[PDB]
Design an enzyme around this catalytic site. Sequence first.
Site, PDB file in Angstrom:
ATOM      1  N   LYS A 143     -64.614  72.026 -41.808  1.00 56.80           N
ATOM      2  CA  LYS A 143     -63.334  72.297 -42.458  1.00 56.80           C
ATOM      3  C   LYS A 143     -62.404  73.097 -41.549  1.00 56.80           C
ATOM      4  O   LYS A 143     -61.176  73.002 -41.674  1.00 56.80           O
ATOM      5  CB  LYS A 143     -63.574  73.006 -43.785  1.00 56.80           C
ATOM      6  CG  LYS A 143     -64.147  72.041 -44.828  1.00 56.80           C
ATOM      7  CD  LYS A 143     -64.656  72.701 -46.123  1.00 56.80           C
ATOM      8  CE  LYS A 143     -65.244  71.607 -47.056  1.00 56.80           C
ATOM      9  NZ  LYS A 143     -66.177  72.083 -48.071  1.00 56.80           N
ATOM     10  N   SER A 182     -64.424  76.614 -49.726  1.00 54.68           N
ATOM     11  CA  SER A 182     -65.156  75.410 -49.348  1.00 54.68           C
ATOM     12  C   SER A 182     -64.883  74.263 -50.306  1.00 54.68           C
ATOM     13  O   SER A 182     -65.753  73.441 -50.588  1.00 54.68           O
ATOM     14  CB  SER A 182     -66.650  75.686 -49.258  1.00 54.68           C
ATOM     15  OG  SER A 182     -67.165  74.954 -48.167  1.00 54.68           O
ATOM     16  N   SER A 189     -73.309  74.009 -45.883  1.00 55.74           N
ATOM     17  CA  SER A 189     -74.648  73.687 -46.328  1.00 55.74           C
ATOM     18  C   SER A 189     -74.707  72.207 -46.684  1.00 55.74           C
ATOM     19  O   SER A 189     -73.687  71.585 -46.974  1.00 55.74           O
ATOM     20  CB  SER A 189     -75.052  74.541 -47.525  1.00 55.74           C
ATOM     21  OG  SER A 189     -74.232  74.237 -48.618  1.00 55.74           O
ATOM     22  N   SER A 241     -69.818  71.866 -44.128  1.00 61.01           N
ATOM     23  CA  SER A 241     -68.485  72.417 -44.331  1.00 61.01           C
ATOM     24  C   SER A 241     -67.942  73.223 -43.157  1.00 61.01           C
ATOM     25  O   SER A 241     -66.772  73.617 -43.209  1.00 61.01           O
ATOM     26  CB  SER A 241     -68.448  73.302 -45.582  1.00 61.01           C
ATOM     27  OG  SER A 241     -68.393  72.504 -46.745  1.00 61.01           O
ATOM     28  N   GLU A 267     -65.674  63.811 -47.520  1.00 57.34           N
ATOM     29  CA  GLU A 267     -66.493  64.453 -48.533  1.00 57.34           C
ATOM     30  C   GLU A 267     -66.714  63.495 -49.700  1.00 57.34           C
ATOM     31  O   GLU A 267     -65.796  62.756 -50.087  1.00 57.34           O
ATOM     32  CB  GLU A 267     -65.814  65.740 -49.066  1.00 57.34           C
ATOM     33  CG  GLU A 267     -65.590  66.796 -47.985  1.00 57.34           C
ATOM     34  CD  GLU A 267     -66.822  67.591 -47.631  1.00 57.34           C
ATOM     35  OE1 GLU A 267     -66.689  68.574 -46.840  1.00 57.34           O
ATOM     36  OE2 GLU A 267     -67.908  67.237 -48.114  1.00 57.34           O
TER      37      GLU A 267
END
Length: 259
Positions: free
Chosen positions: A46, A103, A210, A43, A139
């Site tokens: 992002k 997130s 993560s 992440s 994602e």
Amino acid sequence: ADVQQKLAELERQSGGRLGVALINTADNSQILYRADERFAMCSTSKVMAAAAVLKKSESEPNLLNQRVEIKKSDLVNYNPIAEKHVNGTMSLAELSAAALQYSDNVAMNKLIAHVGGPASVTAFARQLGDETFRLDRTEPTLNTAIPGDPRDTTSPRAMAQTLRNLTLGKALGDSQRAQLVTWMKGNTTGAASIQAGLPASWVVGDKTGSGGYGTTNDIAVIWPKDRAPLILVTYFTQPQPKAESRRDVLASAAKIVTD
Ligand SMILES: [Cl-]
Ligand code: NA
């Protein structure tokens, strides 16, 4: 050099692979550890998707107000904000904030789609002068973090330099840069990572990540008390597919390099 030995000891003790890049803007000095090796971003990517939308908004000023439908088909694995807005719309500004502060993975996918997919996010990084960053997937598959897999990776050195350009430099217009920093300072997910290794009085804007193989990451802009700002990237990954996250390792690395 003493810092290098301390990071090597921490890496050994942890059983994984640790990558660190610190930029001290006071004297333009660097502290680097495995800084040219690739690590899965998870992440932390992002930040680049949000920045690409912000850059677009310099030429389309209404862009952050544009609304995007959220449908059940959009849900993926971790959707804390988007799941509250199913069958309604969110603005691109709201999606940017959800991606960076919670997130939210639907938000990320909507930012990716808006700018034209992973190759378009990557092309944006190239325009900034980052030739290492690569976003390959959407994602949730971009988090697999398989050892040896270059997809969806960057290096600590490159990510620190690019984060410096985005948050302290002139990659974005003044309004857009201020918005990115405000969003990162409002992150809700980072208190146990880099921030846990720093004094309580310092101000941090950060984005965590993560993923598979116990990958545990954090990238941060740091305003120490009465000092020039710092950029700190801490990437960590482990040998076992089902390894647990180790946010404490990132806190320990932050304490070592800021001592
Ligand atoms: Cl395992
Ligand atoms: Na990068």
